[PDB]
Design a protein around this ligand. Structure first.
Ligand code: NAP
Ligand code: 30L
Length: 316
């Protein structure tokens, strides 16, 4: 119903945002422009997506056009794994700010709990293909994130792909100054995340659901993989409500008090995906969608499975 959710930093965050991972650099400027024109006020970004400059061109044009005011936008980015060291965090944030052509971010996330060796490569590997870790722990990285708030570069800080023990580690940090505002995690009917969501919500941490449509454009997709958009059970719920399957998949997390960030570069779908504030899934619909859980996780890497902070060995 309401378009924004209150964060534990006192700011309001739009519950629907536009995802930008895999949005080609030659298409994402127009995608973000269209999104803002049709009502989006939250854009999910990351340095590792390699398209923040182009996202920034769109944001700047719409600000210049006075289609929107800066205070009305909620721009999110993420600290990549090769910048977990305390001496690199500010520069990483500043590069993102410069690319997005902003003087602050609304929310800055630790992208993954796994720190990697700094350098040009986003995934530094040893000769056998294991990622090369950094020895910097999540608590010291968190302290560096807190400094960004105190310097005015970001309004809120949070985490992404943290399991419950990792969230707990932050919450139990000696001398914790700012709690994480958000944990952004994969969540959809095949990976419903009940345990981790309940834990985060119980601590006042807002959960953002990524890959809500199952990321059908993920580069490692296989033909035999399950497909949310094609699941006849979900299509049936959509048909009953006279909505598209994507619209049901977006409304689902909204009714769990989650923020959701579907990605599209297709103008018609960008508009479609925003038309989700005028219908309600029943309790029965919600429980039925939850029943489709199969613990099917699309976003994880074999190269990281021995990293000490790999998040997905733990149940949740
Ligand atoms: N924190 C993290 O580690 C993390 C990880 C993954 C994702 N994310 C964030 O979450 C965002 C969303 O996740 P995602 O990109 O993995 O996948 P997604 O939003 O689940 O799915 C995107 C795919 O769905 C298609 N699509 C969109 N709307 C549609 C509609 N109405 N009908 C049919 N197909 C539709 C898109 O096609 P077209 O674009 O061609 O229209 C694209 O192929 C990402 O872009 C990123 O911002 C964060
Ligand atoms: O991480 C995201 O937001 C989406 O996925 C990616 C986007 C990119 F632009 C580049 C890489 C990825 C990707 O492989 N992301 C997956 C990933 C990253 C880091 C650590 C782990 N891990 O399992 O520990 C997994």
């Amino acid at each position: 119903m309401a378009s924004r959710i209150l964060l534990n930093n006192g700011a309001k965050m739009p519950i629907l945002g536009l995802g930008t991972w895999k949005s080609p650099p030659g298409q994402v400027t127009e995608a973000v422009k269209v999104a803002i024109d049709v009502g989006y006020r939250h854009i999910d970004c990351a340095h590792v997506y390699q398209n923040e400059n182009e996202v920034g061109v769109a944001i700047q044009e719409k600000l210049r056009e006075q289609v929107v005011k800066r205070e009305e936008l909620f721009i999110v980015s993420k600290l990549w794994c090769t910048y977990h060291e305390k001496g690199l965090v500010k520069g990483a944030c500043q590069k993102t700010l410069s690319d997005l052509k902003l003087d602050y971010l609304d929310l800055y996330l630790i992208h993954w709990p796994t720190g990697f060796k700094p350098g040009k490569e986003f995934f530094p590997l040893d000769e056998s293909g294991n990622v090369v870790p950094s020895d910097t722990n999540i608590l010291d990285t968190w302290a560096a994130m807190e400094e960004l708030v105190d310097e005015g570069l970001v309004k809120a800080i949070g985490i992404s792909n943290f399991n419950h023990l990792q969230v707990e580690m932050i919450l139990n940090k000696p001398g914790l100054k700012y709690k994480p505002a958000v944990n952004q995690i994969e969540c959809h009917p095949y990976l419903t995340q009940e345990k981790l969501i309940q834990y985060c919500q119980s601590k006042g941490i807002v959960v953002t659901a990524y890959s809500p449509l199952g990321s059908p454009d993920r580069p490692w997709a296989k033909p035999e993989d399950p497909s949310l958009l094609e699941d006849p059970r979900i299509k049936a719920i959509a048909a009953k409500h006279n909505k598209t399957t994507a619209q049901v998949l977006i409304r689902f997390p909204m009714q769990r008090n989650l923020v959701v960030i579907p990605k599209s570069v297709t103008p018609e779908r960008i508009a479609e995906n925003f038309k989700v504030f005028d219908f309600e899934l029943s309790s029965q619909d919600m429980t039925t969608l939850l029943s489709y859980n199969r613990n099917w996780r699309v976003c994880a890497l074999l190269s990281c499975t021995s990293h000490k902070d790999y998040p997905f060995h733990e149940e949740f």
